[PDB]
Amino acid sequence: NTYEQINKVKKILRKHLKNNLIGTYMFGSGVESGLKPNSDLDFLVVVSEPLTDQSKEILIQKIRPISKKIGDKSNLRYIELTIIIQQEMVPWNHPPKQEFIYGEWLQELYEQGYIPQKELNSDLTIMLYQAKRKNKRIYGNYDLEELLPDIPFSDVRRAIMDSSEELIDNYQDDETNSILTLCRMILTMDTGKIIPKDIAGNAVAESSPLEHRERILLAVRSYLGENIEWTNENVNLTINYLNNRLKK
Numbered sequence: 001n002t003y004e005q006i007n008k009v010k011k012i013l014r015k016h017l018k019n020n021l022i023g024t025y026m027f028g029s030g031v032e033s034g035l036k037p038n039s040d041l042d043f044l045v046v047v048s049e050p051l052t053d054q055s056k057e058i059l060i061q062k063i064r065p066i067s068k069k070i071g072d073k074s075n076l077r078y079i080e081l082t083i084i085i086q087q088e089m090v091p092w093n094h095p096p097k098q099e100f101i102y103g104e105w106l107q108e109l110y111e112q113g114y115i116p117q118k119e120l121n122s123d124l125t126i127m128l129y130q131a132k133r134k135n136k137r138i139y140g141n142y143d144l145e146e147l148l149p150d151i152p153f154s155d156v157r158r159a160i161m162d163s164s165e166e167l168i169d170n171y172q173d174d175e176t177n178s179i180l181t182l183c184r185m186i187l188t189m190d191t192g193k194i195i196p197k198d199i200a201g202n203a204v205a206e207s208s209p210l211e212h213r214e215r216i217l218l219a220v221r222s223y224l225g226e227n228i229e230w231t232n233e234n235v236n237l238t239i240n241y242l243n244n245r246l247k248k
């Protein structure tokens with residue numbers, strides 16, 4: 001069950017962070033759009049004091065058994081956890097301070113003893129900007145709108161352009177999400193609001209040349225139920241186009 005994992009994630013954070021936990025909120029496809037066949041569960045966690053090396057590994061070990069893994073024919077969904085410190089957000093600075101991350105793309109590192117340390121993250125500005133706009137409080141005495149300062153849209157542009165370089169250099173084995181996120185970056189730069197992946201893809205597609213329109217529309221269907229295979233499509237030509245269109 002999908003509501004079963006969220007209830008399990010709530011218990012792990014509550015009974016291990018204890019009174020250090022201020023609140024737990026979801027953003028992403030859960031609160032805004034609808035969960036598409038291969039969507040994920042995006043959580044934003046706000047705590048009071050920094051976590052220790054031993055406390056971070058506990059989460060990695062406790063979250064692992066209930067999160068889908070890349071390559072599974074499973075009923076579970078990918079669990080994404082991001083932990084921020086409420087005091088480290090004010091005064092607002094870009095990029096903000098990120099305390100912890102749980103990403104299934106980082107799984108082959110979690111197994112080798114990798115423990116994410118306090119690091120800066122421009123992409124977290126985009127995450128926080130859309131989380132503060134709409135989310136689901138699953139635990140906490142407060143709303144996330146009460147725990148964060150108002151994030152200016154100028155820093156969101158900076159986050160888009162800074163986080164763009166990591167995405168374009170890493171589309172391999174993530175072609176469907178890299179194409180759509182670039183489409184979401186192009187719009188957010190020009191329209192302001194955050195758009196679901198399918199709509200943002202369909203919008204930038206019909207605003208693009210035919211050779212790129214078709215590959216974007218091809219990713220819109222993969223984000224939905226379709227089983228697209230990018231083996232002989234050359235996504236590089238399209239992400240370079242979406243890059244230069246975003247770069248301009």
Ligand SMILES: Nc1ncnc2c1ncn2[C@@H]1O[C@H](COP(=O)(O)OP(=O)(O)OP(=O)(O)O)[C@@H](O)[C@H]1O
Pocket residue numbers: 027028029030035036038039040041042123124126127130160163177181184185186188189194195196197
């Ligand atoms: N313009 C943008 N709009 C939205 N997210 C953006 C944008 N630019 C970069 N991102 C990043 O893309 C990611 C979106 O999260 P995610 O992959 O979970 O998407 P989603 O909306 O939940 O859709 P789904 O989970 O179904 O694929 C975040 O890490 C966010 O910071």
Ligand SMILES: CN[C@@H]1[C@H](O)[C@H](NC)[C@H]2O[C@@]3(O)C(=O)C[C@@H](C)O[C@H]3O[C@@H]2[C@H]1O
Pocket residue numbers: 040078080103104105123173174177
């Ligand atoms: C913090 N944003 C992450 C980040 O962009 C990940 N890539 C580094 C991205 O990876 C995905 O696209 C994947 O394919 C793996 C999945 C767990 O998360 C998906 O969404 C993941 C995003 O939610």
Ligand SMILES: [Mg+2]
Pocket residue numbers: 027028029030039040041042
């Ligand atoms: Mg999601």
Ligand SMILES: [Mg+2]
Pocket residue numbers: 039040
């Ligand atoms: Mg995702």
Ligand code: NA
Pocket residue numbers: 070173174
């Ligand atoms: Na994948």
